[PDB]
Amino acid sequence: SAVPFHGAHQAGIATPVQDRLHFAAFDVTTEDRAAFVALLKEWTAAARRLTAGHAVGEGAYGGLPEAPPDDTGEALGLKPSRLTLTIGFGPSLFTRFGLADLRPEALADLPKFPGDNLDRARSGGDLCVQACADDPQVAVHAIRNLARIGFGKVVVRWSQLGFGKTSSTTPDKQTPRNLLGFKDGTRNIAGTEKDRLDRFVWAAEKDGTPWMTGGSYLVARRIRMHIETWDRASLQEQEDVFGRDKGEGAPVGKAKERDEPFLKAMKPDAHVRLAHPDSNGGATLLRRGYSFTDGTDGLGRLDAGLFFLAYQRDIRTGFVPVQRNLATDALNEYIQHVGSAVFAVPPGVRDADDWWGSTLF
Amino acid sequence: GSAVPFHGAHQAGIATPVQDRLHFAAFDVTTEDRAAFVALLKEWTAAARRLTAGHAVGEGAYGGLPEAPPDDTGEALGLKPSRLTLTIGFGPSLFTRFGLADLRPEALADLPKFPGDNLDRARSGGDLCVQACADDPQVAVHAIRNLARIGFGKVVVRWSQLGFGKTSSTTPDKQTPRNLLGFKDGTRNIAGTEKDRLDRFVWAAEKDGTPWMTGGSYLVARRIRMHIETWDRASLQEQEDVFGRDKGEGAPVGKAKERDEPFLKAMKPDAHVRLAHPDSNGGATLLRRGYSFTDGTDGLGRLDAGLFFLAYQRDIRTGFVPVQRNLATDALNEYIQHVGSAVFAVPPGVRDADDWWGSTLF
Numbered sequence: 022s023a024v025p026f027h028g029a030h031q032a033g034i035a036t037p038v039q040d041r042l043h044f045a046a047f048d049v050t051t052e053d054r055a056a057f058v059a060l061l062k063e064w065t066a067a068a069r070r071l072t073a074g075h076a077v078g079e080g081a082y083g084g085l086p087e088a089p090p091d092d093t094g095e096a097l098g099l100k101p102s103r104l105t106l107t108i109g110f111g112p113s114l115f116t117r118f119g120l121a122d123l124r125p126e127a128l129a130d131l132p133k134f135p136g137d138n139l140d141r142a143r144s145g146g147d148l149c150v151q152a153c154a155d156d157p158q159v160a161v162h163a164i165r166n167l168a169r170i171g172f173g174k175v176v177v178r179w180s181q182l183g184f185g186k187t188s189s190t191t192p193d194k195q196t197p198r199n200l201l202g203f204k205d206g207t208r209n210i211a212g213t214e215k216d217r218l219d220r221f222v223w224a225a226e227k228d229g230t231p232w233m234t235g236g237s238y239l240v241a242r243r244i245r246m247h248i249e250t251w252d253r254a255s256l257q258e259q260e261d262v263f264g265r266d267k268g269e270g271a272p273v274g275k276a277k278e279r280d281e282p283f284l285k286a287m288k289p290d291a292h293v294r295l296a297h298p299d300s301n302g303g304a305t306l307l308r309r310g311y312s313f314t315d316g317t318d319g320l321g322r323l324d325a326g327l328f329f330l331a332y333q334r335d336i337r338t339g340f341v342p343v344q345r346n347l348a349t350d351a352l353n354e355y356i357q358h359v360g361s362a363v364f365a366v367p368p369g370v371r372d373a374d375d376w377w378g379s380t381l382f
Numbered sequence: 383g384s385a386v387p388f389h390g391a392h393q394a395g396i397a398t399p400v401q402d403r404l405h406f407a408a409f410d411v412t413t414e415d416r417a418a419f420v421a422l423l424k425e426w427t428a429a430a431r432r433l434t435a436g437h438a439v440g441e442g443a444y445g446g447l448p449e450a451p452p453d454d455t456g457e458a459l460g461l462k463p464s465r466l467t468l469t470i471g472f473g474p475s476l477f478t479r480f481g482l483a484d485l486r487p488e489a490l491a492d493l494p495k496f497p498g499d500n501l502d503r504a505r506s507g508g509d510l511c512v513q514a515c516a517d518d519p520q521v522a523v524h525a526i527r528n529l530a531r532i533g534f535g536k537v538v539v540r541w542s543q544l545g546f547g548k549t550s551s552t553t554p555d556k557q558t559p560r561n562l563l564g565f566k567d568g569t570r571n572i573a574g575t576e577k578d579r580l581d582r583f584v585w586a587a588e589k590d591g592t593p594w595m596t597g598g599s600y601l602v603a604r605r606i607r608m609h610i611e612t613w614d615r616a617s618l619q620e621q622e623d624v625f626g627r628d629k630g631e632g633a634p635v636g637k638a639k640e641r642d643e644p645f646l647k648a649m650k651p652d653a654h655v656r657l658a659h660p661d662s663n664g665g666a667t668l669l670r671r672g673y674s675f676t677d678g679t680d681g682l683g684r685l686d687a688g689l690f691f692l693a694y695q696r697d698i699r700t701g702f703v704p705v706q707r708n709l710a711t712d713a714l715n716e717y718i719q720h721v722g723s724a725v726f727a728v729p730p731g732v733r734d735a736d737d738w739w740g741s742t743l744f
């Protein structure tokens with residue numbers, strides 16, 4: 022029901038994937054390094070409370086009547102719900118507080134990719150907080166209260182709600198389906214594979230940025246799906262686009278979802294074939310994204326898609342090569358990248374005295 | 383994860399226990415062929431029978447002809463019914479069509495303008511609506527998506543609203559949820575077991591003068607923005623004065639327990655509960671069934687939160703209108719703004735496998 026907050030790594034990367042997501046990007050408004058360090062310590066104290074299911078500060082009620090309550094109160098009577106709070110620092114943060122020479126080389130700017138249609142306002146950000154939990158209100162309350170605590174030093178730049186499976190009704194190692202109706206996550210780095218996480222996910226001391234040892238690098242892409250066009254495509258077009266069948270999720274020619282794929286039996290521009298590590302020099306990613314549906318746009322169409330989150334040991338050898346290989350993906354006909362951001366996710370909060378960002382500041 | 387029965391004298395999704403998620407869509411009709419519209423209603427009813435049972439619409443989500451698109455879009459495959467209910471309603475603008483003018487019920491009243499109204503005409507009105515409620519948001523989305531897909535060429539989605547968590551209760555034996563202002567919402571509502579109060583305050587009767595609406599109800603939807611920056615800097619005493627209940631327990635001011643009966647004279651004259659209470663409105667009672675929403679930021683560095691307010695009643699003129707008129711002096715008005723609005727006539731239930739949505743009207 023809870024997930025430990027302290028560790029060598031931040032939680033919410035290799036830890037079990039929770040049902041809901043509230044992702045927020047923040048911009049920093051203060052120039053004062055001391056004030057910003059004060060805020061990181063305040064935020065860490067609040068995150069310790071929130072992840073244990075407690076209110077922030079001195080609570081949501083029962084304080085001085087003439088003061089505003091420390092906690093906004095909308096999670097009172099809810100459970101921790103496996104809440105994890107993961108912080109990351111964007112490249113623009115390092116233009117402040119004199120940190121320019123501390124930006125990791127692995128925190129690379131993404132190239133412009135064919136077909137990008139990025140909304141500037143839903144892109145970038147000086148920092149992020151990824152809030153995952155099984156209850157969406159627990160996640161929202163966390164973001165709402167961190168934003169309130171930081172008011173005057175940070176503002177919210179953009180915010181995204183997402184959902185995965187619903188655990189109260191769905192088995193745990195049954196693969197979720199994305200909004201195109203296909204199982205999503207079959208060949209992924211699992212949190213149980215410690216050695217694959219060391220090789221592909223966690224930054225190492227010898228990688229070149231000591232303060233990032235134990236951290237990771239995060240790519241966020243807001244990917245709209247053209248739902249109504251996808252839904253008019255034949256069953257065979259849909260399966261050809263991925264290289265797996267829709268019902269079982271088996272690679273073409275195989276019989277079970279987890280059968281290892283034979284890439285030559287797939288069409289040359291099938292998504293699985295272009296994404297597979299064998300097609301990308303061994304490049305492998307930890308995907309931890311969530312579906313979204315925000316409503317409908319001005320033309321009656323469903324504003325829905327995949328809020329893609331990938332964690333990797335180096336942006337230049339993870340996301341960049343694989344996304345480059347998707348230049349000709351048959352899936353490109355039905356999707357559009359409309360928001361993008363990169364963040365360096367620092368190492369974990371080691372104990373009760375530690376704080377978010379201690380190794381950098 | 384169980385299923386809620388689709389057939390009844392009444393539509394599910396009203397007195398039913400309030401499910402965790404909402405996907406609400408309003409549609410405009412784009413055909414003049416009444417026969418075509420009736421056929422759509424029968425097809426939509428057939429699909430709802432499958433969807434509310436956890437089955438794929440039509441001939442399933444795969445295994446049909448390779449060269450044809452699948453009947454069901456497939457993203458609910460392997461999911462339980464998750465208490466999905468589908469509730470259809472007819473907007474006033476619908477009755478200008480198919481020669482239905484003389485059949486518009488008196489109780490489907492247009493709302494007057496209220497002080498502070500800032501209504502977005504794009505996210506208001508609508509020829510008809512479908513309320514999809516479930517405990518799994520994927521289940522609810524899949525139902526709206528497939529209904530719209532089936533109605534391509536005859537209806538188009540006008541606007542939709544997703545509610546990520548409920549702010550209402552029809553089951554007073556369970557915990558009352560909190561809205562984004564941090565107060566319990568739903569304590570003094572009408573419970574799905576109070577058969578007498580539902581007949582008296584929610585369901586339309588034959589006598590009421592519109593025979594095809596017997597067993598139906600009338601829905602008011604109001605999209606309400608919350609000024610959370612303003613609210614979050616108010617003192618605790620300020621927040622509690624605004625409502626008339628304390629924040630921690632949610633009890634009426636001066637009393638100990640959430641469910642103790644309010645004593646209205648102990649509340650400020652402009653307290654929300656005081657002005658909304660039936661006793662202050664000649665007995666007017668509503669069934670509240672709303673949900674919270676957040677739709678990103680406001681572009682000004684803040685979260686964009688609010689409440690999608692839904693009320694069911696036997697007659698809009700004796701339910702929502704008198705109570706909302708009494709809210710003109712509400713202390714809560716300082717922290718909220720109504721930015722969308724729509725009313726619908728909710729027809730009676732689909733009586734059996736041979737019945738269909740709107741059959742008593744068509």
Ligand code: HEM
Pocket residue numbers: 199201203204205206207208209244245246263265282292293296297298306326327329340343344356
């Ligand atoms: C809306 C956008 C996308 C959708 C719907 C989608 C869907 C899928 C599906 C259904 C699979 C097969 C099941 C699985 O192994 O997970 C898959 C595999 C994969 N996808 Fe995507 N994907 C999307 C975008 C991306 C992007 C942007 C990347 C990387 C830049 C990516 C990288 C991968 C990888 C690495 C695999 C595993 C391939 C393997 O090793 O077998 N996907 N994707």
Ligand code: HEM
Pocket residue numbers: 561563565566567568569570571604606608625627644654655658659660668688689691702705706709718
């Ligand atoms: C964001 C907007 C609103 C919020 C946050 C809100 C909040 C609340 C709260 C906290 C309660 C006390 C607990 C309860 O009995 O449910 C309450 C009661 C009530 N509210 Fe509201 N409300 C809102 C809008 C409305 C509107 C628009 C109406 C009617 C037009 C309404 C009608 C009522 C009624 C009838 C009660 C029950 C009073 C009683 O009989 O004791 N509310 N509301």
